[PDB]
Design a protein around this ligand. Structure first.
Ligand SMILES: Cn1ncc2c(NCc3ccc(Cl)cc3)ncnc21
Length: 407
């Protein structure tokens, strides 16, 4: 089996919160400015009244925590500035304050259990649909009948999937930043983190996860970096899994009244803050996250076009309806679709050279081991294990890979 590294537990490294995010939402919006992110965010902000004086509750151990506190206070100050203006601007350029100049820039780890938990959360369904019925595909021509049937069965099973929400979240924020990176090169622009869903009842909703502030972005090449500060709401207390949050300063910024299985309960609302950066090429990929839906669909269609060659008839219906196989090992056809999707999305969210190395070399050891398995290599192990350092996503697949070696 593979040897995973020893060390302190791995920490979160995505460009935004995943299972820990928190949404401020408005239903079927129709205010003077429905569709301009700044107007949407403010209207989501004013939905919430439990704000309170913020303080640091889990410090970033390598950054200057007074500057993170001041930056969040500045956001509320400048948002409150917009409140006082007669009209609402289309965008907001933050004052180039001391805290923002500092925050915008102007070793072995062990597998922690939070990343498997993220992956499990990415496979669940939500109350809300995140994509339209004809979202998947780029076809110039109308789709033939069999393709259409598969595309609609598959969309039924993943439209509400949590991984799909990560897709649209990511596409939104990456489009917003990439565009801002070009239209406001010298500004510290305030960029809402938005997404849009439809409820089980049919209502269009708008969600605010928090805010980005981008720094100077004269991105001349694909690999040039624009730094940014992320500020994300959450009900997750950082003191439970502090190792998850090494890269973050976390503030407590309000209290929130929630329906629960015990009735109404008041929980603190937190605000996860970190500095971070991205590049033109990374943001272009982030805008492409819908292809995760298409790539997941194809892996599904592959299993069907396989079964269909063996039975001389189209097995699309009998596969999705679960009518030779005798069940579905994940539980249901639906969980197989969402599982494939979640893996593809997390490949995107945690894209790394260590993942591209591990993916190639481990497939080599895979075909060798199951060749040996049903019929009865030391440098290869070093290639694969040269990828096992500190990435939570690489390490978790390596953990998964070792299960396959036992069964
Ligand atoms: C009692 N109370 N109410 C609000 C509040 C707060 N946040 C200010 C705020 C809230 C929303 C916006 Cl769009 C701008 C600024 N901070 C501390 N106490 C507070």
């Amino acid at each position: 089996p593979l040897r995973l590294p020893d060390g302190p537990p791995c920490s979160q490294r995505s460009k935004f919160l995943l299972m820990d995010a928190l949404k401020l939402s408005i239903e079927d919006p129709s205010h003077e400015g429905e569709g301009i992110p700044l107007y949407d965010a403010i209207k989501c902000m004013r939905t919430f009244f439990g704000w309170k004086e913020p303080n640091v509750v889990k410090p970033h151990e390598k950054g200057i925590n007074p500057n993170y506190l001041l930056s969040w206070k500045q956001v509320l100050a400048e948002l409150q500035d917009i409140e006082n203006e007669e009209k609402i601007p289309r965008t907001k350029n933050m004052k180039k304050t001391s805290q923002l100049k500092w925050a915008l820039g102007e070793e072995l780890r062990s597998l922690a259990s939070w990343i498997q938990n993220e992956f499990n959360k990415a496979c669940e369904l939500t109350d809300s649909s995140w994509i339209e019925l004809d979202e998947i595909g780029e076809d110039a021509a109308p789709i033939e009948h069999i393709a259409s049937m598969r595309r609609n069965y598959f969309t039924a099973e993943v439209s509400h999937c949590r991984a799909t929400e990560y897709i649209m979240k990511g596409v939104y924020i990456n489009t917003a930043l990439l565009n801002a990176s070009c239209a406001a090169m010298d500004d510290f622009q305030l960029i809402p983190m938005i997404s849009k869903c439809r409820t089980k009842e049919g209502r269009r909703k708008t969600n605010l996860y928090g805010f980005i502030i981008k720094g100077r972005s004269h991105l001349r090449n694909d690999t040039d970096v624009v730094n940014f500060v992320s500020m994300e709401f959450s009900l997750t207390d950082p003191r439970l899994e502090p190792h998850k949050w090494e890269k973050y300063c976390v503030l407590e910024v309000g209290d929130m009244l929630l329906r629960s299985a015990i009735g109404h309960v008041s929980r603190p609302m937190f605000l996860y803050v970190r500095t971070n950066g991205t590049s033109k090429i990374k943001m272009k990929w982030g805008m492409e996250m819908r292809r995760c839906l298409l790539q997941s669909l194809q892996q599904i269609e592959s299993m069907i076009e396989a079964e269909s060659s063996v039975k001389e008839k189209d097995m699309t219906k009998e596969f999705f309806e679960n009518k030779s196989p005798k069940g579905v090992e994940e539980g249901s056809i639906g969980k197989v679709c969402r599982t494939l999707l979640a893996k593809s999305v997390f490949n995107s969210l945690y894209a790394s050279p260590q993942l591209e190395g591990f993916s190639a070399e481990s497939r080599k050891l895979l075909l060798i081991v199951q060749a040996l398995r049903d019929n009865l290599l030391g440098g290869l192990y070093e290639a694969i294990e040269e990828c096992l350092i500190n990435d939570p996503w690489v390490l978790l697949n390596a953990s998964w890979f070792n299960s396959f070696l036992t069964h």
